[PDB]
Amino acid sequence: NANLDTLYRQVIMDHYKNPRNKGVLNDSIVVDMNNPTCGDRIRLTMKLDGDIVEDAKFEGEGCSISMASASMMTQAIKGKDIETALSMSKIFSDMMQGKEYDDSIDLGDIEALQGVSKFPARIKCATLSWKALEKGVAKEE
Ligand SMILES: [Zn+2]
């Protein structure tokens, strides 16, 4: 269990200390979202080719959970259509609240964030980036 806890922590820390897709995209949708209680803030940019998430980057500062989740999300949604990305967001939200471990879609590293469901107050952290995604694609309708 100690090694297993360390393995969960190492996946999350790999995404936190080696974040994927840091930065700001050219010619993109910009969404800002903040979690004032924990103090997490994310700026998600998304380059859409019509309804295709052609690219997605994020900048931010926050806890390990929120920034790791943003890294994993940007990596997971790249190349998907808006509809699929929103389905993935809903699947992840349900997985965070404990409703459905729907592995119909392979969420990869995102599933390590299931650990955070152990502490309910950090669920918001884990979902910050996904909320940004939804705000992003309700902006360009
Ligand atoms: Zn946080």
DSSP calls for 106-129: --GGGGGGGGGGGSGGGHHHHHHH
Contact (CB, 8 A) for 57 and 69: no
Instruction: Please tell me the distance between residue 122's alpha carbon and the centre of ligand 1 in angstroms.
Output: 6
Structure tokens at 15: 């995404």
Pick the closest to residue 73 from 51, 50, 91 (CA basis).
Answer: 91
Binding-site residue positions for Zn(2+): 38, 40, 63, 125
Q: What is the resolution of this structure in A?
A: 2.0
Instruction: Please tell me the distance between residue 49's alpha carbon and the centre of ligand 1 in angstroms.
Output: 31
C-alpha distances out from residue 2 to 11, 76, 92, 109, Å: 14, 28, 26, 19
Angle at 32 between CA 44 and CA 65, to 5 degrees: 65
Binding-site residue positions: 38, 40, 63, 125
Distance CA 74, CA 96 (A): 17
Domains in the chain, CATH or no CATH each = 1-141 (3.90.1010.10)
Pick the closest to residue 11 from 73, 77, 68, 96 (CA basis).
Answer: 68
Contact (CB, 8 A) for 95 and 123: no
Contact (CB, 8 A) for 117 and 98: yes
Distance CA 111, CA 54 (A): 23
Instruction: Please tell me the distance between residue 97's alpha carbon and the centre of ligand 1 in angstroms.
Output: 16
C-alpha distances out from residue 20 to 2, 15, 56, 58, Å: 27, 7, 10, 9
Instruction: Please tell me the distance between residue 57's alpha carbon and the centre of ligand 1 in angstroms.
Output: 19
Structure tokens at 68: 């790791």
Instruction: Please tell me the distance between residue 44's alpha carbon and the centre of ligand 1 in angstroms.
Output: 16
Instruction: Note residues around ion ligand 1 (Cβ under 5 angstroms).
Output: 38, 40, 62-63, 66, 125
Backbone angle region of 50, left / alpha / beta, with phi > 0 → left and psi within -120 to 50 → alpha: left
DSSP 99: S
Instruction: Please tell me the distance between residue 124's alpha carbon and the centre of ligand 1 in angstroms.
Output: 7
